[PDB]
């Protein structure tokens, strides 16, 4: 029964995003910026190389307990720390307990699902668990922030990470190091296969186009369109449970019509969707391309993720932390200096024309995901 694990996987998934889009609108407020919020980011894109080499000495199960420890930490520091200094200091242990939970989780999904059908269909779940705290990170911060009080939240988190923790001890039960069989191939003989480049640049790309969308659309707005403080929220809504549709449904769809050709149509499709998004108006001309947005980077990332596992299944030896690595990698690029470069270029040049720039980007390199297919 290794759906026990796969429910642990979804878990640590949605409560490491629950936290991490709990987090965004509170401080600022507590406090009354860019490091603290790039931090994670930076900090897991350093330790996914040591996490992958780590995850072949002692195995995945250690890693992944500790990943529950670090979180349970990150979250009472959360919940108690009011200084700068300790709130990055937690922000940190969050960004190295998440590299440990989506490297050692993200193994053993492929290692225990090993199907090439099966995997893409369970990591669709488990990226549904990214989508549903995503989703439900925002709302159950804002209300358990104005009921009850500023902790709130942390404490009710902190007792599912526990819950998460016991059944972590009952079946992962980490008791002893159990070291790996075979030596993965090294990282510069990952990064010199230009397959494995240009799945990591589309992963790259597409998410680069939404982490500088997202904080700068409200910049925008509020200078177009002038919209009240709910429109921003419910702007963005669309692009979220879009994501979660596309997510669950193309994980098991994609197989059919094609990873290929599904990033090649979800990079147009995200292409045109922020050349699209300038010309509109209101919110109701904005419904549609952000759905398409959320939409196309779901078929991407549902479809680039098994991918990676197959790459080194058909090229190098099977072992799957030190791939991953580089594919989280491809997400931290993105959203690490993203808002940095998007407001930098916004107030260089323009929106527009960044938007412009990002769209032509995307639609230049959607031609080399032609390469991606199978030979026979
Ligand atoms: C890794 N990853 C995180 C978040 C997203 C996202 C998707 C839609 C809306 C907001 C964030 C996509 C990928």
Redesign the pocket.
Same mark, same amino acid.
């Given at each position: 029964s290794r759906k026990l694990i796969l429910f642990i996987v979804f878990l640590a998934l949605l409560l490491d #995003?629950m936290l991490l889009t709990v987090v965004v609108p509170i401080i600022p407020s507590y406090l009354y910026v860019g490091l603290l919020f790039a931090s994670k980011a930076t900090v897991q894109l350093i330790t996914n190389p040591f996490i992958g080499l780590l995850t072949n000495r002692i195995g995945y199960p250690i890693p992944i307990f500790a990943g529950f420890c670090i979180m349970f930490v990150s979250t009472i520091m959360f919940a108690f720390s009011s200084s700068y200094a300790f709130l990055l200091i937690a922000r940190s242990l969050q960004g190295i307990g998440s590299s440990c939970s989506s490297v050692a989780g993200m193994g053993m999904l492929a290692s225990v699902y090993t199907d090439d059908e099966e995997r893409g269909n369970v990591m669709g779940i488990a $990226?549904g668990g $990214? &989508?549903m705290g995503?989703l439900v990170g925002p709302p159950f911060g804002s209300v358990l922030y104005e009921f009850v009080g500023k902790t709130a939240p942390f404490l009710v988190l902190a007792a599912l990470v526990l819950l998460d923790g016991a059944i972590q001890l009952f079946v992962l039960q980490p008791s002893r190091v159990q070291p790996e069989s075979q030596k993965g191939t090294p990282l510069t003989t990952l990064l010199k296969d230009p397959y494995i480049l240009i799945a990591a640049g589309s992963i790259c790309f597409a #998410?680069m186009g *939404? &982490?500088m969308l997202?904080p700068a659309l409200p910049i925008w707005m509020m200078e177009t369109m002038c919209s009240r403080k709910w429109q921003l929220g419910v702007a !963005?809504l669309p &692009?979220?449970i879009? /994501?979660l549709i596309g997510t669950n449904i193309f994980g098991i769809l994609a197989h059919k019509m094609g990873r290929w050709l599904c990033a090649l149509l979800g990079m147009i499709i995200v292409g045109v969707s922020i050349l699209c998004i300038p010309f509109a108006k209101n919110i109701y001309g904005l419904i549609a391309p952000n759905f398409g947005? =959320?939409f196309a *980077? =779901?078929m991407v990332?549902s479809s680039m993720m098994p991918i990676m596992g197959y790459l080194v299944d058909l090229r190098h030896v099977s072992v799957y932390g030190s791939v991953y690595a580089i594919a989280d990698v491809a !997400?931290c690029m993105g /959203?690490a200096i993203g808002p940095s470069a998007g407001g930098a270029i916004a107030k260089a040049i323009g929106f527009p024309w960044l938007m412009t720039i990002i769209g032509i980007i995307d639609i230049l390199f959607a031609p080399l995901c032609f390469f991606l297919r199978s030979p026979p």
């Open positions: #995003n $990226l $990214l &989508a995503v #998410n *939404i &982490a997202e !963005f &692009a979220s879009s /994501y947005v =959320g *980077i =779901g990332d !997400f /959203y």
